[PDB]
mmCIF file of C-alpha atoms (C1' of nucleotides) in Angstrom:
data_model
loop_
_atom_site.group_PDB
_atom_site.id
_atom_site.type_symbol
_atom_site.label_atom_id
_atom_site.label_comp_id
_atom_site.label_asym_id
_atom_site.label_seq_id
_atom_site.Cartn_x
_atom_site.Cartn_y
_atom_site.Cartn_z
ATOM 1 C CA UNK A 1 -7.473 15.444 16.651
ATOM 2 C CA UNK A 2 -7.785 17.665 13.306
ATOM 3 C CA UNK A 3 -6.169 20.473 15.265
ATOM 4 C CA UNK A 4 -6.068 24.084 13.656
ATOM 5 C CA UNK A 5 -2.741 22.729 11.718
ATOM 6 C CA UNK A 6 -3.622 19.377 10.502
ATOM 7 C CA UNK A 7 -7.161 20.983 9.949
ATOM 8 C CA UNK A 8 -5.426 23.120 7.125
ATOM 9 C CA UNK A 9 -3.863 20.481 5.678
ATOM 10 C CA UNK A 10 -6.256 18.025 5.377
ATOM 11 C CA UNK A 11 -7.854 20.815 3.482
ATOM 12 C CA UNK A 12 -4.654 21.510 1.600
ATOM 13 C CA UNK A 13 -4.493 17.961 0.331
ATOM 14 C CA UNK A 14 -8.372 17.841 -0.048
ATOM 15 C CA UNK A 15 -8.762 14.281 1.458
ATOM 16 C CA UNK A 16 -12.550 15.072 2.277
ATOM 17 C CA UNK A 17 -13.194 15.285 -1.480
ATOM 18 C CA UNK A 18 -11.689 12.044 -1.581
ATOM 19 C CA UNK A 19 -14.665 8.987 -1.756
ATOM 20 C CA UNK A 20 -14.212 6.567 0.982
ATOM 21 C CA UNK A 21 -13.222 3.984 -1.953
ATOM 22 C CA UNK A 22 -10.005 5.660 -3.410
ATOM 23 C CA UNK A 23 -8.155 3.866 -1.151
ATOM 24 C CA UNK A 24 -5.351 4.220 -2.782
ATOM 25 C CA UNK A 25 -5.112 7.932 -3.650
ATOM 26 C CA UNK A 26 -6.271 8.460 0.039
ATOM 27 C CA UNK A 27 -3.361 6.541 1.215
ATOM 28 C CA UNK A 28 -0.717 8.273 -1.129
ATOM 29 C CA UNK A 29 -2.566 12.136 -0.187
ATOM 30 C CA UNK A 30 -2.494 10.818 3.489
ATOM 31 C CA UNK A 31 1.615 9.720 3.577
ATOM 32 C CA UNK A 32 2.353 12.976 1.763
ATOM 33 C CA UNK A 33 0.397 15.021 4.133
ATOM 34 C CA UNK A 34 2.083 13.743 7.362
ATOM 35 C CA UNK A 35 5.447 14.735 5.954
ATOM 36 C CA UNK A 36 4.289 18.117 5.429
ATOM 37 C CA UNK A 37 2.959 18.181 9.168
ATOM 38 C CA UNK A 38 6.351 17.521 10.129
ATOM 39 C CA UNK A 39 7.810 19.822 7.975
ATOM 40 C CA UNK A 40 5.455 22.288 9.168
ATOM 41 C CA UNK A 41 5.896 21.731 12.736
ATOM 42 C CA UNK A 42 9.613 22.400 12.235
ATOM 43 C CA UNK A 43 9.502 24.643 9.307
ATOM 44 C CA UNK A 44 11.435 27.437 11.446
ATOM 45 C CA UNK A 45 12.240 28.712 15.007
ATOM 46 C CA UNK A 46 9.012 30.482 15.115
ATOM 47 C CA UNK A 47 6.925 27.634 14.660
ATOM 48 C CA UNK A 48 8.855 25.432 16.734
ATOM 49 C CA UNK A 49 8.845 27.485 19.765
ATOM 50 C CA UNK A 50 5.092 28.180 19.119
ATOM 51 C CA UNK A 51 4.198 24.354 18.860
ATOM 52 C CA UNK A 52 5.978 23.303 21.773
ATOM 53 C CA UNK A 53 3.676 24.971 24.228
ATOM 54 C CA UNK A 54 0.521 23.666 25.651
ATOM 55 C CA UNK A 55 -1.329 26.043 23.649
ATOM 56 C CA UNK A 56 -1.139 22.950 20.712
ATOM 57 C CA UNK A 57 -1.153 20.016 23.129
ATOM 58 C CA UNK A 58 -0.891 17.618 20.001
ATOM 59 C CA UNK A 59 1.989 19.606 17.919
ATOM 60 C CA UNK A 60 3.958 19.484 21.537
ATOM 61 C CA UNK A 61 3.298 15.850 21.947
ATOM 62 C CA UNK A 62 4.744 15.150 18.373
ATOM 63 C CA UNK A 63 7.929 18.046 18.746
ATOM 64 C CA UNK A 64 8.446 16.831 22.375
ATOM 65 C CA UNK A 65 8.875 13.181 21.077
ATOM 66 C CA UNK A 66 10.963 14.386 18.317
ATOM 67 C CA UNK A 67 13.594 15.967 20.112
ATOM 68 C CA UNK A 68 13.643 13.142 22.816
ATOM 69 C CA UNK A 69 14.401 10.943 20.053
ATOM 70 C CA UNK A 70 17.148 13.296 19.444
ATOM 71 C CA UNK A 71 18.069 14.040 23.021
ATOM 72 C CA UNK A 72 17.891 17.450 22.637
ATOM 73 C CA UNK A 73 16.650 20.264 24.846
ATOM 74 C CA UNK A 74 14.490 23.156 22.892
ATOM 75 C CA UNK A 75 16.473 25.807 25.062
ATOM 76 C CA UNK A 76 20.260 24.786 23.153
ATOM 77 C CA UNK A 77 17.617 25.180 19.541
ATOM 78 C CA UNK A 78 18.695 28.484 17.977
ATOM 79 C CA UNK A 79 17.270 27.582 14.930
ATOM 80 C CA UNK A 80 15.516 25.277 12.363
ATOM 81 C CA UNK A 81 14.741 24.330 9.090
ATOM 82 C CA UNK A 82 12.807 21.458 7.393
ATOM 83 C CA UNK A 83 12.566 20.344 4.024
ATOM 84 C CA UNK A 84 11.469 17.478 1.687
ATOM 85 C CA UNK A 85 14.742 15.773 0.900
ATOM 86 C CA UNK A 86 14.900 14.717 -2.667
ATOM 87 C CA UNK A 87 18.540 13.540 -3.969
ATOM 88 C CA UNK A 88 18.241 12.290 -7.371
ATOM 89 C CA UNK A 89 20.576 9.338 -7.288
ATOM 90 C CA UNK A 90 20.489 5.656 -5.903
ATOM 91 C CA UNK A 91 23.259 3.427 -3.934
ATOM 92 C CA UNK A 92 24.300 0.840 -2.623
ATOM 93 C CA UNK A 93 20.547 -1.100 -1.747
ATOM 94 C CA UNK A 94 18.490 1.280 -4.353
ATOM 95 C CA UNK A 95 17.208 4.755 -3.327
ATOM 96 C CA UNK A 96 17.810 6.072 0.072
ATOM 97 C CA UNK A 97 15.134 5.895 2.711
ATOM 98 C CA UNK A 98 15.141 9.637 3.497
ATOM 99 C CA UNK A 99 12.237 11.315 3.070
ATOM 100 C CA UNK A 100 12.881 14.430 4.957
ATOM 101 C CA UNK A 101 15.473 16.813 7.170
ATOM 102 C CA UNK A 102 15.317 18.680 9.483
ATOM 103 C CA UNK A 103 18.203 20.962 10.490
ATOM 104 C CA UNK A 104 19.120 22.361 14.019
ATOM 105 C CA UNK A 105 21.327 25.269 14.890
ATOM 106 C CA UNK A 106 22.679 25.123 18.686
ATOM 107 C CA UNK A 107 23.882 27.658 21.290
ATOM 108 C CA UNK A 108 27.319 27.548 19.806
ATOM 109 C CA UNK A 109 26.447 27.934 16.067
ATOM 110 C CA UNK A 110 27.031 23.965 15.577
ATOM 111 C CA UNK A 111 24.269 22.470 13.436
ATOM 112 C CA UNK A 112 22.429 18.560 13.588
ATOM 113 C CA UNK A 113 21.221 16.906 10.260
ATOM 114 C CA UNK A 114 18.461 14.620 11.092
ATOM 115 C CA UNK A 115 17.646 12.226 8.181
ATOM 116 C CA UNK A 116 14.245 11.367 9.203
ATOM 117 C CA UNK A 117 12.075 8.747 7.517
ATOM 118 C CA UNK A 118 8.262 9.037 8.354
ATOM 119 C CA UNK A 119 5.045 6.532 7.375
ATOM 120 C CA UNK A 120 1.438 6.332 7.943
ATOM 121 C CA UNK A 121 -0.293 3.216 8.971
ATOM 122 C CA UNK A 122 -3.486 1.942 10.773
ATOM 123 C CA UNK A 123 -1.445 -1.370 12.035
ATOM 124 C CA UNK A 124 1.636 -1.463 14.399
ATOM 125 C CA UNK A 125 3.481 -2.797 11.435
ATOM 126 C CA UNK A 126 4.347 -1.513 7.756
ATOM 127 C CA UNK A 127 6.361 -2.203 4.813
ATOM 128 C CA UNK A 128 9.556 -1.107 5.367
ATOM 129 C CA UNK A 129 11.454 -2.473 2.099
ATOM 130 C CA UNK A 130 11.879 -5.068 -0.255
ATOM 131 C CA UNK A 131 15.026 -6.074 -1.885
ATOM 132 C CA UNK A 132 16.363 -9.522 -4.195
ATOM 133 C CA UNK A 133 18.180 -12.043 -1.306
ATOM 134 C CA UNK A 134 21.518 -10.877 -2.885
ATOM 135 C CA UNK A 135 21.206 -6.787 -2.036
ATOM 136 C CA UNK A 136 20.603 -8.098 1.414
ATOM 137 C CA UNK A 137 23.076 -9.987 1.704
ATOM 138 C CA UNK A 138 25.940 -7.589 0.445
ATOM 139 C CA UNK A 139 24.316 -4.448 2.541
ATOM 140 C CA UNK A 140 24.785 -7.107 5.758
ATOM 141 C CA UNK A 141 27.655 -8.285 5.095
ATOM 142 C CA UNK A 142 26.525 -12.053 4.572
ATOM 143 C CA UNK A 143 28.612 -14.250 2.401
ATOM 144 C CA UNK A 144 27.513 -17.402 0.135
ATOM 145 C CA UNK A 145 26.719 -20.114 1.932
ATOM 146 C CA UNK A 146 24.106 -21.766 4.225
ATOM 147 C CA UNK A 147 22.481 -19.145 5.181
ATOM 148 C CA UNK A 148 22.017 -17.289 1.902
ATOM 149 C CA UNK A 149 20.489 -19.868 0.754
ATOM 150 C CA UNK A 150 17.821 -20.379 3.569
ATOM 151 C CA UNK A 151 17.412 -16.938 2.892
ATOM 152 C CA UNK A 152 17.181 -17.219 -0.680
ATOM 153 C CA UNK A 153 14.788 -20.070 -0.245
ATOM 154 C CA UNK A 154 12.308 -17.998 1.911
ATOM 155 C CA UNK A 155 12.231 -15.727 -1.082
ATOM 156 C CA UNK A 156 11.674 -18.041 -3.717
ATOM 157 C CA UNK A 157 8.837 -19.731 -2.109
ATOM 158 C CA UNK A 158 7.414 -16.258 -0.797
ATOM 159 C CA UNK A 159 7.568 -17.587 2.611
ATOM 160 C CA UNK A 160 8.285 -20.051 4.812
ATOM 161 C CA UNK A 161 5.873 -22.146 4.923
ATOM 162 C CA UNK A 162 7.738 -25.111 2.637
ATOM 163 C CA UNK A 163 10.427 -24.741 5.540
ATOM 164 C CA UNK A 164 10.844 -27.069 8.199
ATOM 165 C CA UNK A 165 10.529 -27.006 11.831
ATOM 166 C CA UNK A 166 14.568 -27.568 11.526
ATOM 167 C CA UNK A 167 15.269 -25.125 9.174
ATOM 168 C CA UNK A 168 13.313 -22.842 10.450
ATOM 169 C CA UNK A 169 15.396 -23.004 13.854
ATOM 170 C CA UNK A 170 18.717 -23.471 11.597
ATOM 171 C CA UNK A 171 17.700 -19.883 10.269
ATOM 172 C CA UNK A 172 16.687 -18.081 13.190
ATOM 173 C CA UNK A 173 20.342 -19.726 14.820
ATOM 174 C CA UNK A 174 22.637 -18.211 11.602
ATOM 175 C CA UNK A 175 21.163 -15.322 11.815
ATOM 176 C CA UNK A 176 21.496 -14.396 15.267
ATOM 177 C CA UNK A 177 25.052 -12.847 14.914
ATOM 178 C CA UNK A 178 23.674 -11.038 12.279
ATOM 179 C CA UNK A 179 20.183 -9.241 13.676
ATOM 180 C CA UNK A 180 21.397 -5.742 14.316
ATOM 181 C CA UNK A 181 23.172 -5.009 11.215
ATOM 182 C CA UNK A 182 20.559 -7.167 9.118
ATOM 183 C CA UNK A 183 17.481 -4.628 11.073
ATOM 184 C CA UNK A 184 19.604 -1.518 10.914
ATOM 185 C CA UNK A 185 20.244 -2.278 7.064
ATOM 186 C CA UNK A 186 16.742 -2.818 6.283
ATOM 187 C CA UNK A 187 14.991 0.251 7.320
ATOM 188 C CA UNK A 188 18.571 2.756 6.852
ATOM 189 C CA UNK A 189 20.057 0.812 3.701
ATOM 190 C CA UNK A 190 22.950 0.508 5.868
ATOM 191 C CA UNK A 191 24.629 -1.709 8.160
ATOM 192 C CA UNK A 192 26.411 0.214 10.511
ATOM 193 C CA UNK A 193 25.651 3.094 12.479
ATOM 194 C CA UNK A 194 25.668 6.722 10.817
ATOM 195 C CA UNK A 195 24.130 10.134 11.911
ATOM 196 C CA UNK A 196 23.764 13.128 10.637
ATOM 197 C CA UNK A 197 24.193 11.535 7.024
ATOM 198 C CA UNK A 198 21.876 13.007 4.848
ATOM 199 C CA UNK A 199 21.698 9.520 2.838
ATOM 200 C CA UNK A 200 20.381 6.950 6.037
ATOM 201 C CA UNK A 201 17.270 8.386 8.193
ATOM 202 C CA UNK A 202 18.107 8.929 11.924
ATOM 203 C CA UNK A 203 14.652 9.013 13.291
ATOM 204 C CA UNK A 204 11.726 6.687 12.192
ATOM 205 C CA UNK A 205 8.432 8.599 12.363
ATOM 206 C CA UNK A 206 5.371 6.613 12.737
ATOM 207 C CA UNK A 207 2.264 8.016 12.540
ATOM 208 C CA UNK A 208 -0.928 5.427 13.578
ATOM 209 C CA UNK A 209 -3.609 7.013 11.640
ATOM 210 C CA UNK A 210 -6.944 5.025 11.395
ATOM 211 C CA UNK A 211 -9.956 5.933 9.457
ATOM 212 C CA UNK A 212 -8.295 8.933 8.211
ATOM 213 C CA UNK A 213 -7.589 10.566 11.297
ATOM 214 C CA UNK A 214 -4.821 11.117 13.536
ATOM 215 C CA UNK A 215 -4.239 8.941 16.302
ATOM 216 C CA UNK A 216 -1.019 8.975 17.928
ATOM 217 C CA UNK A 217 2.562 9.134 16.442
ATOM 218 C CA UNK A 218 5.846 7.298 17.414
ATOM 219 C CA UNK A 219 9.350 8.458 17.093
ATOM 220 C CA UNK A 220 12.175 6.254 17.451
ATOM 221 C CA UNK A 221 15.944 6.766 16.733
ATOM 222 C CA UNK A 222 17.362 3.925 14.797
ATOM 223 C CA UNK A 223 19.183 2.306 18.047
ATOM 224 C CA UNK A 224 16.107 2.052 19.809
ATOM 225 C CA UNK A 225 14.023 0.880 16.837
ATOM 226 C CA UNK A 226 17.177 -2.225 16.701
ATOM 227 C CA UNK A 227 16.249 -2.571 20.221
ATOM 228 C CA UNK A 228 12.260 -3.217 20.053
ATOM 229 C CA UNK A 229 13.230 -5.197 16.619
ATOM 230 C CA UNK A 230 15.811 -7.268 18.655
ATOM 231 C CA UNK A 231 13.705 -7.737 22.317
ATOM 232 C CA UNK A 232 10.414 -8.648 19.563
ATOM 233 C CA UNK A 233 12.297 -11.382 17.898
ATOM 234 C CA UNK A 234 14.322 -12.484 20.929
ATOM 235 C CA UNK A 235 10.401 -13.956 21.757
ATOM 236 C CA UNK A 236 9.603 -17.738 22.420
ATOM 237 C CA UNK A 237 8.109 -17.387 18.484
ATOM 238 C CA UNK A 238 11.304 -15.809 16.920
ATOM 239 C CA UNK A 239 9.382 -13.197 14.954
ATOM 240 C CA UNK A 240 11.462 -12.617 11.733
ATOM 241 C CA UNK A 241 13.834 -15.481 12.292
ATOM 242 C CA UNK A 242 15.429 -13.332 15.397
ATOM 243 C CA UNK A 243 15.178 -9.583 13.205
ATOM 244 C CA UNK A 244 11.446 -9.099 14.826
ATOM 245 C CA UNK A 245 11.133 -8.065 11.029
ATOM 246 C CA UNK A 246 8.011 -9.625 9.193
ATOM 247 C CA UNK A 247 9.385 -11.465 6.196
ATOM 248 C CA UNK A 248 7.211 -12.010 3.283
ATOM 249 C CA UNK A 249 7.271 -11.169 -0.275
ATOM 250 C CA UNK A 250 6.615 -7.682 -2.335
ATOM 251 C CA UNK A 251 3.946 -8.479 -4.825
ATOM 252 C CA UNK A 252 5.506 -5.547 -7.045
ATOM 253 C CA UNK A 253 7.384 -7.270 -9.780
ATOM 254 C CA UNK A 254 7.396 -10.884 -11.234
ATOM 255 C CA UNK A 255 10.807 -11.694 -9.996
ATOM 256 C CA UNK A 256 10.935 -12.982 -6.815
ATOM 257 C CA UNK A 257 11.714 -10.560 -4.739
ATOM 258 C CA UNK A 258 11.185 -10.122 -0.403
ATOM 259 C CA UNK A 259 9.475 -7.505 1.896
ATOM 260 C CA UNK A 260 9.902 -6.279 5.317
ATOM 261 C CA UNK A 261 7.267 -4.867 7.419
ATOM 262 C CA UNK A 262 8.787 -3.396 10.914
ATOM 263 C "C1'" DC B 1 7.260 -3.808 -15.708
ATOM 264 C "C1'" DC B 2 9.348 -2.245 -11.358
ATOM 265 C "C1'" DC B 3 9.332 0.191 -6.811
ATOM 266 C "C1'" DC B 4 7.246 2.397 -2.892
ATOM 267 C "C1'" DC B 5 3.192 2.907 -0.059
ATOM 268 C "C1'" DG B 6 -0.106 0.231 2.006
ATOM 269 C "C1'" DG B 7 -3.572 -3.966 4.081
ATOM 270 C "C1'" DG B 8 -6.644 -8.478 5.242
ATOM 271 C "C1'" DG B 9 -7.479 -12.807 7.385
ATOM 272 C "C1'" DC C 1 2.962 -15.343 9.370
ATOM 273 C "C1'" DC C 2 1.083 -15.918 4.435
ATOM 274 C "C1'" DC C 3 -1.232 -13.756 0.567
ATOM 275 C "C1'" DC C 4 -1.761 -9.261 -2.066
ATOM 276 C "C1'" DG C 5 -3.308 -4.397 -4.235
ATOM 277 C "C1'" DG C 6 -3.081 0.823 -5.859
ATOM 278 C "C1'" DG C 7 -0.393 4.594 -8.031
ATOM 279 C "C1'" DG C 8 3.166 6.453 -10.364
ATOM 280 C "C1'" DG C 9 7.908 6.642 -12.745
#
DNA sequence: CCCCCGGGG
DNA sequence: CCCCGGGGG
């Protein structure tokens, strides 16, 4: 719903004025106007407090699955902040998938960083990266070997379809040990787990927006995002080799190079 | 040219 | 799963 919020910003970023064939303006306008809902929605106490009340039964929805992500209770919130994070510098993987914070200041004057990492997209899955088979590798915490190179051969060819049946399995069977740090790395650019570490996103926001309009929003904390990855891949089909990550390649460059939608 | 944000069939 | 495109640095 365009409530009196996203109303204002749909106006702010002027996506009417947009013709329904700049796609791809629309879509950049679009993923930099659901940050600034978010950022909005927790731009300070005052708006917090106001948009968690039924009197913005959309704003509540997304704020109420925010801090359940968080497992947080709005009466230990003394205050908040939000703001477009933007820190100049790459590592380890490239740039860090951050894309906002959000800070909270408890009861006790103790304070959360949440590294949050938010999308738009009219399908259940989206690019989440793309990186050369050797970044991947390192961030995992994969060696040389047999399964670098399976790996490494999915990239080259820009799929798997010159696999076979047997290497297909073979993958899907070296991997295995490695699906939680391999989905964890993708989407945080880290292997491990980390929190309040302004460099790797705690929450995933995911906002389903179709035809240019809101339709629903999803908020997961990176655990339970490994945990739909892992149950989605643990399928009789193996999505992703075991990662429930959709491997293909990113048409950006002329090296070879491999995407993951999640 | 490369990376990040996306999608169709 | 396989095949691709727009925008901006």
């Amino acid at each position: 719903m365009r409530t009196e919020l996203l109303s204002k910003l749909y106006d702010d970023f002027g996506i009417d004025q947009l013709p329904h064939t700049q796609h791809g303006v629309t879509s950049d306008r679009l993923g930099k106007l659901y940050e600034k809902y978010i950022l909005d929605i927790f731009k300070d106490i005052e708006s917090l407090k106001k948009y968690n009340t039924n009197a913005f039964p959309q704003e509540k929805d997304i704020s109420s699955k925010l801090l359940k992500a968080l497992n947080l209770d709005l009466d230990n919130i003394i205050d908040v902040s939000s703001s477009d994070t933007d820190l100049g510098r790459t590592i380890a993987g490239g740039s860090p998938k951050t894309d906002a914070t959000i800070r909270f200041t408890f009861h006790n004057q103790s304070s959360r960083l949440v590294p949050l990492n938010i999308k738009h997209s009219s399908k259940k899955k989206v690019s989440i990266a793309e990186y050369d088979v050797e970044t991947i590798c390192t961030g995992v915490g994969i060696s040389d070997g047999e399964l670098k190179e399976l790996i490494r051969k999915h990239q080259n060819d820009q799929s798997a379809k010159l696999f076979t049946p047997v290497q297909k399995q073979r993958l899907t069977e070296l991997l295995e040990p490695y699906r939680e740090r391999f989905i964890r790395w993708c989407v945080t650019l880290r292997a491990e787990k980390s929190e309040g570490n302004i460099l790797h996103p705690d929450l995933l926001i995911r906002f389903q927006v179709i035809d240019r309009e809101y339709v629903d929003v999803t908020i997961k904390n990176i655990d339970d995002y490994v945990s739909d990855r892992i149950a989605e891949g643990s399928k009789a089909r193996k999505p992703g080799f075991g990662t429930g990550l959709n491997w293909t390649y990113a048409s950006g460059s002329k090296a070879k190079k491999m995407q993951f939608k999640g």
